[PDB]
Design a protein around this ligand. Structure first.
Ligand code: T1C
Ligand code: T1C
Ligand code: CL
Ligand code: CL
Ligand code: CL
Ligand code: CL
Ligand code: CL
Ligand code: CL
Ligand code: MG
Ligand code: MG
Lengths: 196, 196
């Protein structure tokens, strides 16, 4: 088959869905493409290069709330940003593991920049704007990993608690924790210089 | 060398430090122990069994703020709990990756139970107590992973922001985000049934 960038990524994503992060090899990406390993090599050097590209390409393709709508509150943006971040990570088996520890690619530099600008304009110190943006990211990743990573006679609450986590996606926990985070930030922002 | 449970774990942890999660194999745990692979097999079946045991054993050994002091506020406990959770994850290379997606072992059942009890007694609905405990966990894991997982000409804020994240551990971001979370929970709790 065709070996341009896009069709390579297509084949990788489809294969990531079949095997998970661990099972994904260059050797298997070749087979899937019906080519020899040395041919693939011209196109992709190794597993690391592939993952970095997938990590970038998954957000580019399916993370569509990178930016705030015209006139959106900062609270609302973060919320939408986080929900869309989450959906994109979950769209692929081990997708969060694929994303873990990637650096903002040159190609989203102006995105991550706009986010920080947007916070600074909303009354955030650059420090605080960055802390809120990281906390959202770290919270969302962490909740997606544990969702995906999961996939002796229980004391009472533990039994019960496990039923409510299983009863849905993990979506309630996530959306509840997200509101906690944003309110916490809000309380901090508005306090300014007061003891809070 | 000696092949009891504790000395096996000792050798695994030391080896996890040498290679990271990916590089850790049974074959190498044998060598390190100066034994043959089939001997090791009697003691440990495979990589999964080893990781589950390490994951449990790292918290047991070095997570010493499992429980609240007598009369501690819930805010204070969560904070201490989270700092101690974090330290324990960071004490080992890829330690957070080792912990990811583990289920509370039978041997900490009464710990995780006490935590939930302790929240319920502090005015939390079982649902809410669980949401706060997960959000803390997910936030802390996520911040530790990205710390550990990290380890084209930058626009201005992005450049600056990256310097402040690098200037320390990631400890400021973490401790700042943690306070946001706890205040957010606090605001929710105290509101009860009011629109909040
Ligand atoms: C805060 N900025 C400067 C930043 C810094 C780091 N990395 C580090 O701090 C790494 N730590 C070092 C400095 C290497 C020791 C970061 O790793 C990140 C980011 C930006 C976030 C932004 C994320 C964002 N959402 C979830 C808040 C988002 O929607 C996008 C996007 N493209 O639309 C992201 O890129 C984002 O999800 C993301 O992954 C970020 C970072 O990776
Ligand atoms: C909330 N409880 C019932 C719970 C549930 C899950 N797992 C899931 O929800 C998995 N999702 C399913 C239900 C399989 C789809 C959980 O995965 C966890 C826990 C408990 C936390 C407690 C953590 C705690 N700190 C960080 C808040 C802690 O200090 C300890 C400890 N031993 O001292 C923990 O065990 C803890 O860190 C931890 O890892 C938890 C869970 O793993
Ligand atoms: Cl074709
Ligand atoms: Cl081609
Ligand atoms: Cl193309
Ligand atoms: Cl000996
Ligand atoms: Cl022995
Ligand atoms: Cl022993
Ligand atoms: Mg990222
Ligand atoms: Mg856990």
């Amino acid at each position: 088959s065709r070996l341009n960038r896009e069709s390579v990524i297509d084949a990788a994503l489809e294969l990531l869905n079949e095997t998970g992060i661990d099972g994904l090899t260059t050797r298997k990406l070749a087979q899937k493409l019906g080519i020899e390993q040395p041919t693939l090599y011209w196109h992709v050097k190794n597993k690391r290069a592939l993952l970095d590209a997938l990590a970038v390409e998954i957000l580019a393709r399916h993370h569509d709330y990178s930016l705030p709508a015209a006139g959106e509150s900062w609270q609302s943006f973060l919320r939408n940003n986080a929900m869309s971040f989450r959906r994109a990570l979950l769209r692929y088996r081990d997708g969060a593991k694929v994303h873990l520890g990637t650096r903002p690619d040159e190609k989203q530099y102006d995105t991550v920049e706009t986010q920080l600008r947007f916070m600074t304009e909303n009354g955030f110190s650059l420090r605080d704007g960055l802390y809120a943006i990281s906390a959202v990211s770290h919270f969302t990743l962490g909740a997606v990993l544990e969702q995906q990573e999961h996939t002796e006679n229980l004391p009472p609450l533990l039994r019960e608690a496990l039923q409510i986590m299983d009863s849905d996606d993990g979506e309630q926990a996530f959306l509840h924790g997200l509101e906690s985070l944003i309110r916490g930030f809000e309380v901090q922002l508005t306090a300014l210089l007061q003891i809070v």
